[PDB]
């Protein structure tokens, strides 16, 4: 137990002297109040400590004690449906303890200790046990929660408690050597949880938005980034993913973004319904909220805590989704700390190791054969907030090179209140090919062909815009104008989607395939008609364009009949032209 | 606390800083009193403390100081302000010393000016609907109580006039919402930073005319006043606002007059300290510092109060990518952006609907709050105006005669919009009149082109012509 | 075309100016760091 | 054996050791912490007072009371032998395929020694990459450095793997020829995600290409110093094989943008003032030391080629990385986003592509006598066709002449049957046959660039030869 | 010091049609006249000096050509004051700091000019201060900051330039002087971007 | 040192009609030849070396690509001097370099070449110096300047680039040697933006 005394206080940084023996990146308690802090540099007998709480009011000469362990998170039952601060401190308990304001120094355990869980042992006395094997099971909000042997524990089981009600502190299992395995276990947040193997992504992460789920898919082990200037709709898109994604558990990490978003989540999600289980949606989500005005140093801790919790739930066998609300704020926190350290910046003041940190964070995503033998996954969808919409910021460029999918928002579309406001030209996805076998078996035998046809039509429209901007949109010939109009129909009736509607908010793959079929059939018939001499000025007046436009809003159950009717109507309308 | 401690031995004075050698006892963030030979007392705040010395940022100018006779003494370990219920109807300077000629307020409590973050769990959904009386705001960029809505101004646009108009006309509408009828008016907390005498006189005259001085608090930091004082005025104003709102059930409207001057003061202090600048020389922690000011607004569960914010911010080169607007947009909830093109044409208030935004609109407009058709009308107006502007750009390259009839209709709609919806002078339009004008304008377009709106609302409201309202 | 070319030149000059200022600040902070290292390592 | 325990400073990626005069600059060291874990490190500055060590990985457990630094090797070296063929490495040389480590024939320094200009000779033979748009219009000659510029989302990795699988030499076409000419492919991937690693391993192991290729795979989350070292180790092995066993080695560097970013990060870590656009001032010389280790030397039958693959940051051709790579290399094969979105694979755009050494590796006794003229004619015809296709959107198809309509059809047929060759491997003769079939669609006598003899000899075939059996 | 600032409600008739008609400036107001070289800053300022209706005019050549001050000297004595009838030079005070004179003196010149204008305001007159170039004042600040080894904010200027300009301009305004009389000061500062 | 510099009174016959007639370069003059790809710059430079009136030809390759330098090195030996009928290499000096060679060598290549040319001038001959790719030399200079942490100017080049270019191009000129003979150095420096 090393002890020292503060020597210099400068913002979130504290330099303590007399700490000869402290280790880099170990949690230390600063001052009488015991503010948490992390060592990030050792000079002689002095340690540079960044404090995860406001340091206003401290004094020189106050004690600083190092715990000797790196930042750790308590993993175990009791985390779902909760809300946590940057360093895994429950915020409901803080609300009960203090008033409506967060205050420094509150000590609260991550997992409730007074709540009893129904324990059903799986292992038996005298049997082998290895890291990641399932000791037992515990019910939790309709989930089945598996108690896992920590990743680096081995031995033979001496005695196991019989099925009953216990608290997380109870030593449910005792190994031969004498170690007692409770219902939880700490784990450094900076160390990736070990796994057996990494599998190639072969399943889609249905986000519920047509554009993302069709033109720019993200696999079950994938990573996606959604940059865009303020007002482009990043928060709405990520909340939609949290609401409608097919993941079993959703970890939302508000790394230094507006406070009101967390309140929106807390107040809405308890009332919505989980798409699959059917129970309350808040029972499948964990919120790690670190609002903008909360201490700056805690943003990196929040990101790491979130990813570690996601990795735990993966190790349980679930498929998880991790929404990093803003990684640019993580970069900014790193920059402020570096400034306090007086290092040598690179680029726009960011420390050199920013790219390495981002790569380390992202490479924890992927589909995995957990240590227990089951299969799980983690999908990371991290937003980026470049200043002034610059896609040349170091953060965005560093993200371009490790993310498999890119969803670039646009200011021009956002101004016209056209959402999701994805700039089609700039976005891309590298999971398109690896997902084809799944689409051919669970959406439609020819879904890839329709997707490619729609992409080709949009590309032709983009090519023709180069001319339209030059010679007006009326000097074009008939075929080119038909391409332009079909491009408009695709933009306004397929890609567009009102996240606030009661029906259009979610769109299964069958619905998207049907709408694509409708548009492509219409285009084929219209091109045929134009060949034989019909006038575009009258093709745009047909009464089936209205049905194609309204196809978005029809419910998910009525859609098949509506689609059959629409196809028949298309055939009839273009046949009657003779 | 009762005894008085003094530190001689100053060893450095340059710009806004000041170093004291043996100030090991001084606490980080403490407030100190600097006394010179003549006997004058200035203020300062510790921003770094160490065994070797302590940095003090002097609020007032450093003229007259010296390394021989100057002394530094402690006042409080943490910056505090003496809030009280009786400070309504009083004027204070950037630090809190009265300037109205009345005696100092007997504090009910002393609160830390820096404040504390609001627990996300204890926050509440901002729902109530404020009727700002400006159609471009009430209809398309709704303002809900408990919201942060900066007014991105320009070099010489009338942002102050719009802020005064909102303060004067803003009233909630219980009748539409179905809540108990009451008429509790807004309390105004007016934080000023580098305001020229002209703007300050205008604001004072407007408040006197509307009678709002009886229930408003002013924190004036005029242009000629010391620059580093600006780092405290927003925090003190918001401390007063939060105290009133969440300890007395007041609906407080906070107006910060020029956040650009605040950012200038912050840049001065940061550059004097050798901070790693971000873009354009501003310090790297400007985002967090501005967050600590803005994010002190909202609504709290179990308390009837509410703190609203309207930070007025002047974009330097009418530039929206300047660091100050960028960070303010990333922190606040939407923005009302004035435009120079509309101003030159004579429109007032020259709010540009396209770049503006309001992220809390959907929580305050809809069935049972304002009217069934609000959201769809707003969306359709956005789409129509955007098409009108795109066609207006096309004309200047392809000539008027080339337009079809649809394009001409959209262009006429854009012109009529700019001249009948945005431009409203100083009149106080209710939400109903604004929606009526919106439908009157939308009637110009064909019924088949209003794709955003549902058919029921189209049937119910479509048709009434703009000529009926005027001419 | 000449208008777009002029705008391109203007933006290039502005960005180069910003980069030059950044290098200057970097050089001075490096000098201060070197001074501190020489004084106390 | 000797352990320096006088640590006096740890911060980020650096740590200082006192009484370390004995250590040599650029030496590799092992840092042992209290728990017993061992991290790597490289000395970056040695002084009478102390020695600065840049740590690989992280510094999460170090402290000033127990950390000890011990020497490993005076100057970075790599064990090299013929047996490397069929293996995989992590960028520092440690295997990652699970097979036993190699027993080196000799240990060579990683940093390369410059080739003597008077000891080089002109590139005069071609490599058949199997991609028609490269083998015909932008040939790749032994000893050439021909980068493949790509974009953010384009399939650079797929093209790299295809070139690795298909590239072969054609000794028969050269005069009497020889029965055998050994060939090897050294693959150096820098900063590639786990998905890309799985894809590369599967693609190399699926078709027996691993039996003649050496892979230096470096993950994105691995230390950046390993990223800096990966291309140098790969090129060291390539030089060894080529110039000491007479191999014809082809080196693919998967992402030079990641290498440049790692170089920038390292330069910033050592307190160096950045040069242009925030990149190190000496990036030109570093990229030269990597690129210019390829060539052909006099008196040795071997050769080393390179196909650097760099993703232009924002499709900017004037960004420092593509610009410097252009100065130092000869030509570029530029992938296009338009062709990719249209569904064409590989999406190579012949219009901006160029190969500066093509005229030397083409002609009689190498390919066929009509290669150069066919390439020129295809380039001209495609440019004209794309221009006419732009014009038709304004003037309408009926208002074109006959030859313009022919060019408009030819552009589409070219884009569909020449570029869009998919995964099929095309010999040089098949590519030339398809080129002649496409040119046949144009009216003879409009093939101005080609001499009359070739037109007579080859003109006339039908496009159905390849359509009926792709 | 002053008792109370007042609201500008009378015009500062500059004798130029465009300014006095389309873009007026009140008696106690402030104006800026940016313009590239060869646009008319000097002639406009001299016209403001010659014909304006200010009781006393203070001209501050904060870093400009010496020929301008010489022209003022050699012409003004002959001209006639519109309102008093005497020579025009009897109501103008010049503060000449030409370009090649010491750099650091530009700041002092600006401050001395504004102080003298404030004095003549305190006496009851209406004054007009014409700062010939505040960009040269900014350059002086930049040079001194460079010697101090401070950190530049943008383009090399010290971060406190805005505060200095604000303090200089805020001294304009119509006022009830401490003696009870009414006075004003108008500042028309040129800028040379 | 030279005894005295003379005026450009005689031409440097390059043997090519366009250059010798429409765009002559005087003996002791300087010329620039931007080299794109496919423009046959190599052939033009070899023609200048073969046919010009210069007695000795110095060719400097500052930082040429590897294979371009290989072509250069393997093409001169085969050239045939038209006057003596023997190899042209018996009257030329080649200074070769490549991008991977040390920066100092690339930076000093042109100075070494020009000093050798000055020597052969002092003997009493007429020397033709052909500094190919002075842009690569500028790149080497920029790298050296950044190594010393100098402040750049323009597109990252050091502020003294023009000074060095002048110091290199002004050693050309026909002069009366210290020994009373007559000699000249003519520089033809390529530029490759
Ligand atoms: N109002 C005017 N009437 C007539 N001629 C004018 C007027 N203003 C300017 N000029 C002419 O234009 C010239 C430029 O004007 P002036 O000397 O005021 O330039 P300036 O804007 O101060 O520029 P600089 O800083 O380059 O000297 C004047 O010398 C005179 O020739
Ligand atoms: Mg002038």
Summed up:
This is part of a larger assembly, with three copies of chain A, two copies of chain B and one copy of chain C (41 residues). Chain B is of the alpha/beta class.
Description of the structure:
It is classed as hydrolase. The entry lists the keywords rotary ATPase, V/A-type ATPase, V-ATPase., hydrolase. 1 sulfate and 1 ATP bound V1EG of V/A-ATPase from Thermus thermophilus. The structure is cut from a larger assembly and holds three copies of chain A, two copies of chain B and one copy of chain C (41 residues). Chain A is α+β, with helices and mostly antiparallel strands and 578 residues long. Chain A is built from 16 helices and 26 strands. In chain A, the strands form five sheets. In chain A, strands 8, 18, 19, 20, 21, 22, 23, 24, 25 and 26 form a ten-stranded mixed sheet that branches. Chain A has a six-stranded antiparallel beta barrel with strand order 1-2-5-4-3-6. In chain A, strands 12-11-9-14 form a four-stranded antiparallel sheet, with no helix packed on it. The relative contact order of chain B is 0.12. The radius of gyration of chain B is 25 Å and the shape is elongated. In chain B, a hairpin with a 2-residue loop joins strand 2 and strand 3. Chain B is of the alpha/beta class and 471 residues long. Chain B has one domain (4-462). In chain B, helix 2 packs parallel to helix 4 (197-210), helix 10 (374-398) packs across helix 12 (431-442) and helix 11 runs antiparallel to helix 12 (431-442). Helix content of chain C is 95%, strand content 0%. Classes of the chains: A alpha+beta (578), B alpha/beta (471), C mainly alpha (41). The interface between A and B is large, with 67 and 75 residues. Magnesium ion is lined by residues 37, 41-42 of chain E.
| Biggest sheet layout of chain B | 7 strands, antiparallel
Chain pair sharing the greatest interface: A-B, 67 and 75 residues
Biggest β-sheet description of chain C? none
Radius of gyration of chain B: 25 Å
Query: Alpha-carbon distance between the termini of chain C?
Result: 57 Å
Biggest β-sheet: strands ordered side by side in the sheet of chain B: 1-7-4-5-6-3-2
Number of helices of chain B: 14
* Helix proportion range of chain B: 25-40%
Family (chain C): Belongs to the V-ATPase D subunit family.
Organism (chain C): Thermus thermophilus (strain ATCC 27634 / DSM 579 / HB8)
Function (chain C): Produces ATP from ADP in the presence of a proton gradient across the membrane.
Protein name (chain C): V-type ATP synthase subunit D
């Amino acid at each position: 137990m090393i002890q020292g005394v503060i020597q210099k206080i400068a913002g979130p940084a504290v330099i303590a002297k007399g700490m000869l023996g402290a280790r880099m990146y170990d949690i230390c308690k600063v001052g009488e109040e015991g503010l948490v802090g992390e060592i990030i540099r050792l000079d002689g007998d002095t340690a540079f400590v960044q404090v995860y709480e406001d340091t206003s009011g401290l004094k020189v000469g106050e004690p600083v004690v190092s715990t000797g362990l790196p930042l750790a998170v308590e993993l175990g039952p009791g985390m779902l449906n909760g809300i946590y601060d940057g360093i895994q401190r429950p915020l409901e308990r803080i609300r009960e303890k203090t008033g409506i304001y967060i205050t420094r120094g509150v000590v609260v355990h991550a997992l409730d200790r007074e709540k009893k869980w129904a324990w059903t042992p799986m292992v038996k006395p005298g049997d082998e046990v290895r890291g990641g094997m399932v000791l037992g099971t515990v019910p939790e909000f309709g989930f089945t929660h598996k108690i896992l042997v920590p990743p680096d524990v081995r031995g033979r089981v001496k005695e196991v408690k019989p099925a009953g009600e216990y608290t997380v502190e109870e030593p449910v299992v005792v190994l031969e050597d004498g170690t007692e395995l409770k219902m939880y276990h700490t784990w450094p947040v900076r160390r990736a949880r070990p796994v057996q193997r990494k599998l190639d992504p072969n399943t889609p992460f249905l986000t519920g938005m047509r554009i993302l789920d069709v033109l720019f898919p993200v696999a079950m082990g994938g990573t996606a980034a959604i940059p865009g200037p303020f007002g482009a709709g990043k928060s709405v898109t990520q909340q939609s993913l949290a609401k409608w994604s097919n993941a079993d558990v959703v970890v939302y990490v508000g790394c230094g973004e507006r406070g009101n978003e967390m309140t929106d989540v807390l107040v809405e999600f308890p009332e919505l319904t989980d798409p699959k289980t059917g129970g309350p949606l808040m029972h499948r989500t964990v919120l790690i909220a670190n609002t903008s005005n909360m201490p700056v140093a805690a943003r990196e801790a929040s990101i790491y805590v979130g990813v570690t919790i996601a990795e735990y739930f993966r190790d349980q066998g679930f498929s998880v989704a991790l929404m990093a609300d803003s990684t640019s704020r993580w970069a900014e926190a790193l920059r402020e700390i570096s400034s306090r350290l007086e290092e040598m910046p690179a680029e726009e003041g960011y420390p050199p190791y920013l790219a390495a940190r981002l790569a380390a964070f992202y490479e924890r995503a992927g589909k995995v054969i957990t240590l227990g033998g089951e299969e799980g996954a983690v999908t990371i969808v991290g937003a980026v907030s470049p200043p002034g919409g610059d896609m040349s910021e170091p953060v965005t460029q560093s993200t371009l090179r490790i993310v498999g999918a890119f969803w670039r928002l646009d200011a021009s579309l956002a101004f016209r209140r056209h959402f999701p406001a994805i700039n089609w030209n700039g976005s891309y996805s590298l999971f398109t090919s690896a997902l084809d076998p799944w689409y051919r078996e669970n959406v439609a035998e020819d879904y890839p062909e329709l997707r490619d046809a729609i992409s080709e039509l949009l590309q032709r429209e983009a090519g023709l815009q180069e001319i339209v901007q030059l010679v007006g949109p009326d000097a074009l010939q008939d075929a080119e104008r038909l391409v332009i109009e079909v491009g408009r129909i695709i933009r306004e009736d397929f890609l567009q989607q009102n996240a606030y509607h009661e029906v259009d908010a979610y769109c299964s793959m069958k619905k998207a395939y049907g709408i694509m079929k409708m548009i492509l059939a219409f285009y084929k018939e219209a091109e045929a008609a134009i060949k034989r001499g019909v006038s575009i000025d009258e093709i745009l007046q047909l009464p089936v364009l209205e049905r194609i436009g309204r196809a978005r809003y029809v419910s998910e159950e009525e859609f098949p009949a509506y689609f059959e009717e629409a196809m028949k109507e298309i055939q009839g309308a273009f046949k009657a032209l003779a | 606390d009762l005894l008085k401690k003094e530190y001689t031995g100053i060893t450095y004075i340059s710009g806004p800083l000041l170093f004291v050698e043996n100030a090991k006892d001084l606490a980080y963030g403490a407030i100190v009193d600097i006394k010179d030979g003549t006997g004058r007392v200035r203020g300062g705040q510790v921003i770094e403390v160490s065994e070797e010395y302590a940095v003090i940022q002097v609020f007032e100018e450093t003229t007259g100081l010296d390394l021989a006779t100057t002394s530094v003494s402690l006042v409080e370990d943490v910056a505090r302000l003496g809030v009280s219920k009786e400070m309504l109807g009083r004027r204070f300077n950037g630090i809190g010393k009265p300037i109205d000629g009345l005696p100092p307020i007997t504090p009910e409590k002393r609160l830390p000016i820096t404040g504390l973050p609001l627990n996300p769990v204890a926050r509440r959904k901002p729902e109530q609907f404020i009727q700002t009386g400006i159609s471009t705001i009430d209809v398309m960029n709704t303002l809900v109580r408990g919201q942060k809505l900066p007014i991105f101004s320009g070099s010489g646009l009338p942002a102050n006039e719009i802020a005064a108009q909102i303060a004067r006309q803003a009233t909630v509408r219980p009748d539409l919402s179905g809540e108990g009828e009451k008429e509790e008016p807004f309390a105004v907390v007016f934080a000023a930073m580098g305001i020229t005498q002209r703007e300050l006189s205008y604001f004072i005259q407007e408040f006197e005319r509307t009678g709002a001085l009886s229930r408003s608090v002013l924190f004036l930091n005029k242009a000629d006043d010391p620059t580093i004082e600006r780092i405290l005025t927003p925090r003190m104003a918001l401390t007063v606002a939060e105290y009133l709102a969440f300890e007395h059930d007041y609906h407080v409207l906070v107006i910060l007059t020029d956040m650009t001057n605040y950012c200038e003061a912050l840049r001065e202090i940061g550059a004097a300290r050798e901070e790693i600048p971000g873009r354009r020389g501003y310090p790297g922690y400007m985002y967090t510092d501005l967050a600590t000011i803005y994010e002190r607004a909202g609504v709290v569960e179990g308390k009837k109060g509410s703190v609203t914010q309207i930070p007025i911010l002047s974009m330097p080169d009418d530039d929206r990518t300047h660091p100050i607007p960028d960070l303010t947009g990333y922190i606040t909830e939407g923005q009302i952006q004035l435009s120079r093109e509309l101003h030159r044409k004579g429109i007032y208030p020259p709010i540009d609907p396209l770049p503006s935004l309001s992220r809390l609109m959907n929580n305050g407009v809809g069935k049972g709050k304002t009217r069934e058709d609000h959201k769809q009308v707003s969306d359709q107006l956005y789409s129509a105006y955007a098409n009108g502007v795109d066609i207006r750009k096309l004309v200047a390259i392809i000539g008027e005669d080339a337009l079809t009839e649809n394009d001409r209709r959209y262009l006429q709609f854009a012109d009529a919009f700019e001249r009948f919806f945005i431009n409203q002078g100083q009149q106080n339009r209710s939400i109903e009149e604004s929606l009526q004008i919106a439908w009157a304008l939308l009637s110009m377009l064909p019924q088949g082109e209003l794709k955003r709106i549902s058919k029921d609302h189209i049937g119910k409201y479509y048709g009434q012509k703009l000529e009926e309202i005027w001419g | 075309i000449p208008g777009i070319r002029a705008q391109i030149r203007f933006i290039q000059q502005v960005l180069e100016q910003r980069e030059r200022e950044d290098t200057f600040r970097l050089k001075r902070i490096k000098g201060k760091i070197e001074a501190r290292e020489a004084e106390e390592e």
